[PDB]
Amino acid sequence: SRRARIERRTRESDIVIELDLDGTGQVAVDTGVPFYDHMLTALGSHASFDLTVRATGDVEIEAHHTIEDTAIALGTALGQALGDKRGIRRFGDAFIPMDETLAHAAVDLSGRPYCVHTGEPDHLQHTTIAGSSVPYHTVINRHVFESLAANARIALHVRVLYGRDPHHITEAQYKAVARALRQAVEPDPR
Amino acid sequence: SRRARIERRTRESDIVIELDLDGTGQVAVDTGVPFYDHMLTALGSHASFDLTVRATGDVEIEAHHTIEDTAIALGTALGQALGDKRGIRRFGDAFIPMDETLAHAAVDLSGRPYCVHTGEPDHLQHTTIAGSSVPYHTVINRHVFESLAANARIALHVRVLYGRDPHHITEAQYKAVARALRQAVEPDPR
Amino acid sequence: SRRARIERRTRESDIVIELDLDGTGQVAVDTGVPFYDHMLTALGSHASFDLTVRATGDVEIEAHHTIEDTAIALGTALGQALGDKRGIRRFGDAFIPMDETLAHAAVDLSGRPYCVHTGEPDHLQHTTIAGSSVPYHTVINRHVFESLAANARIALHVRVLYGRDPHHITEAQYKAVARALRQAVEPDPR
Amino acid sequence: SRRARIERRTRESDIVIELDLDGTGQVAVDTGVPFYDHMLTALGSHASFDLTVRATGDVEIEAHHTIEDTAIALGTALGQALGDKRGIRRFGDAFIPMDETLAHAAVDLSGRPYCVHTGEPDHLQHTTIAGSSVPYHTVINRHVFESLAANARIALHVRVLYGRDPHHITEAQYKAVARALRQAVEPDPR
Amino acid sequence: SRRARIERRTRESDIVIELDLDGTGQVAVDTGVPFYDHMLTALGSHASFDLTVRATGDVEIEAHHTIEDTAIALGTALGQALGDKRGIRRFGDAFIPMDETLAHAAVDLSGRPYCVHTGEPDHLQHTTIAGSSVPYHTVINRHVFESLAANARIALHVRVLYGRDPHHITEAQYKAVARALRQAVEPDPR
Amino acid sequence: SRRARIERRTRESDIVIELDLDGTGQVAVDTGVPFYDHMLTALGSHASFDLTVRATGDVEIEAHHTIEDTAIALGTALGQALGDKRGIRRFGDAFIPMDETLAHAAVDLSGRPYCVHTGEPDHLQHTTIAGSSVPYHTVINRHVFESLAANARIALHVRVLYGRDPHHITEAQYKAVARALRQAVEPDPR
Ligand SMILES: C[C@H](N)c1ncnn1C
Ligand SMILES: C[C@H](N)c1ncnn1C
Ligand SMILES: C[C@H](N)c1ncnn1C
Ligand SMILES: C[C@H](N)c1ncnn1C
Ligand SMILES: C[C@H](N)c1ncnn1C
Ligand SMILES: C[C@H](N)c1ncnn1C
Ligand SMILES: [Cl-]
Ligand SMILES: [Cl-]
Ligand SMILES: [Cl-]
Ligand SMILES: [Cl-]
Ligand SMILES: [Cl-]
Ligand SMILES: [Cl-]
Ligand SMILES: [Cl-]
Ligand SMILES: [Cl-]
Ligand SMILES: [Mn+2]
Ligand SMILES: [Mn+2]
Ligand SMILES: [Mn+2]
Ligand SMILES: [Mn+2]
Ligand SMILES: [Mn+2]
Ligand SMILES: [Mn+2]
Ligand SMILES: [Mn+2]
Ligand SMILES: [Mn+2]
Ligand SMILES: [Mn+2]
Ligand SMILES: [Mn+2]
Ligand SMILES: [Mn+2]
Ligand SMILES: [Mn+2]
Q1: How many Å lie between the centroid of ligand 6 and the Cα of residue E19?
Q2: SS3 for E99-144, per residue?
Q3: Which residues line ligand 2 (CB under 6 A)?
């Protein structure tokens, strides 16, 4: 019913997305960027989407191209799956506490792309989350939210009220976006 | 069930309101102040009210008297239609993104009039929204929210978190008030 | 189903709590600290808990030991009654207007104790609410929210956006916590 | 070759656009908003487009809905007329002196919507340009540039380096956008 | 006609450059520093050079020696390929929007080395762009522009007007330099 | 075709100008003010004018009268040679790096005299460039640009973005004006 498959092939990367808005959190994400996989898994899961993301790209340069192409493809999938948007809540918002961090997201499935990203501490503009694989530059958080909003053609407002840990700050925002979208896409009984 | 017809006849104006709290967004508004009509249409629609507003007044002076008398009559209608307020959520709140603008409203159907209006940029105290008819002075936004709260006998908190466009800022607040009221008036299953 | 009886006996006090998460606001609170009774009655009632609190302690010293032991016991009861937390909303938040005051609470039933308490005016750190019985030092507000979060093993974020009256400020926060918990404990239909 | 006809019919307005990128400045604009007509005539003319804009809307509210719908439709027309964007300069920029005013615009026909609007004096956020017809609120300048960029799917950077007259400031920006687009859409001989 | 092959062999690295000023963007770059490869590919491509860069060096230390030796060799190639500079535009400049970033470069093929690098945010002095290979320290951006200007014996002015993403900021500057050089090297018909 | 001879005889000086807009940089300048000769030679040359300037005046007082009368006569020559301005680019701009200095000029051949001169360091208001002949007070730079714009009846915006050497700062501005005029006077193929 509210399903979309998107294939996005650029010079930099290859994305396949399958998205059901009316899922149960059946999520599988593989981008070659394990922190990004974790954020997109949290997003699909907390939005009660069924979501599959398979992506490969030029991670020898860094994660940016793959992260962005994935967020563009995912936005386009959200846009297509929503269709005409008849009968939905349209507006959604969620607070996510994560230990010391409090994040908020608010959505209007308006059909007009807009993203306002505020309150993220300045040190996230040069912070790296790094393990044994491809690292994740938190400066990309904004870019992901912008790409998503631009291609789904929605208003997306993401706020960090406060926080310290860059992992708590980043995950709280992805989870906020996710639960905001969940409320906004659900059928409006009136 | 939760219906009220209010007639308000002053030296300055004539107001008829018909309000059903349990509507489907069947809204008709005619005040001679077309921007106000647009805001009150957004309010009735986003609150899932059935609402009829017919108003005439001294618009040769300006919109103020008609705007205020209408907001007083509309408040009184909300107050009467709520009745004893048995079994309702009582508390409601909503975030409204509108492009660059984010507004919020929170309500307590307490039976104690109170309005706190914060965060609206200072230039809305001398901004005019003007077309081919009677103009709308955004300084009146507060007055409308105050009049509504005073006569419905509710606590109404309206916040502009941020914004630039006076039309986005004003409409976002009316829509926030509307969805806050919608959540607050709905039956509480517990 | 989601019931817990907690008995807590310290050198300073004796607490019995009985808590049903799936109640109708059947609340009885007796701590010897009548303002605290009023706050805990508001909390149980606004959370739609069935709640019984019987506490006696060393109020000849002041309310602190009894308030804290009660909040610890109540937290432990919330923790036990939630059990494995299968199938619940998990996240909850609420705005509470109270005349001039606006408070907010957000919860994550994470299993990781955390409390962030912000925005409370500085004069509540030496304010007393006093009647004909044992008085209530508002400096204890934070301590109560911290104790509750620590022993229920949840993330609890409590914000005063603004306010003036210490009674409005305190009650608004307890009511916010209550409605945040109510949303968070309810079954998630998905 | 690089032609597009767009029809956009909303609740608020009716837009017809016909756009040839490879024109000689054959421009006809009728929106019911004569200052807007003047700005869009300057844009089509200074971009050497052939452009026809016919729009009607709810100007009894004010110009906003009609201005925005027109800018959305015009953006969509630019997007469609560019097609695959094979063989073009892609990047374009122009300085426009206008008496005391200096404006600049830079474009990347990237396929990624983005608009950065800077340097416009603060008083243009509540300035009105008013004649004998529907007035023009200069706060809308940004909104127009944003709408255009979002729907043409280009990067558009518009700068006021300095200026005083709101008419000089506004027209200089529209002319800058126009000549930036003209350079960017032209065939790249290499 | 305007071709140069440069071989540069230091203790730290081995560089081979082949450069045609009058190319079609036939570019192949391999330095062992994949982000640098991406920047130098963008530069050759956006300048419509035919360009081959093969470099190996002491990347076990970090990218610096290889980046610098490559920029020195590339500058020397630009210098030799320009020859006597008879009949060329000499002056060139370009604006590059890249999402939120706006960069500018201006060139004078003067025969006097000079580089002015301004406006780059302070956090790019300790930012790393890191993937699965050798990372790129953005502090090197200036060094690259300086090395290039010193060895091509040109005036090179590179400006970041504004920006946030270090990848957008860096790539925008390389693209600006590239299009500035493209305009400056082209035959002057007068 | 686009030629003008101007003779200007005041109490203070005697000017003969011959100007072809469609020249090859055939320039001869003799004012008795050798630094001025150098600046006007750079201007005619970098604008691809054919230009002859012969001037004599009261240099025993200082260069001012001769500089100004020459700039007035030269402006009048530009005005007359442009004629009706049918079919020209009209708008032109150029960046000129000169070692540490970056200057910019933008022109609108509008038929409305206007000059905005900004960014020149304050010490150029009392700097002298002095050799073995009549010296040049850099405070006159503005006066020259103003005189030129007033009598050619064009908008001329001249910016020093930054610089240190008064000779680099002055020459960069004359060269910027020159290349801005060159782009603006050239035939517009559309
Ligand atoms: C496991 C969860 N994703 C988490 N990330 C950082 N902190 N926590 C609790
Ligand atoms: C049409 C809607 N009422 C609106 N007003 C201002 N902007 N937008 C989108
Ligand atoms: C009765 C209620 N608990 C209250 N306390 C302070 N103000 N109000 C209304
Ligand atoms: C006529 C032109 N559109 C203009 N508008 C304001 N000033 N000027 C010269
Ligand atoms: C693909 C392109 N090189 C790019 N890098 C960062 N952002 N974008 C669009
Ligand atoms: C020779 C040229 N006119 C010049 N003047 C000052 N510096 N330079 C290079
Ligand atoms: Cl989780
Ligand atoms: Cl709407
Ligand atoms: Cl109550
Ligand atoms: Cl908030
Ligand atoms: Cl014009
Ligand atoms: Cl600039
Ligand atoms: Cl590119
Ligand atoms: Cl020279
Ligand atoms: Mn990007
Ligand atoms: Mn995690
Ligand atoms: Mn009044
Ligand atoms: Mn509207
Ligand atoms: Mn204690
Ligand atoms: Mn009370
Ligand atoms: Mn709008
Ligand atoms: Mn005009
Ligand atoms: Mn070095
Ligand atoms: Mn890139
Ligand atoms: Mn003078
Ligand atoms: Mn010189």
Answers
A1: 30
A2: CCEEEEEEEECCCCCEEEEECCCHHHHCCEECCCCCCEECCHHHHH
A3: B 167, 171; D 12, 64-65, 68
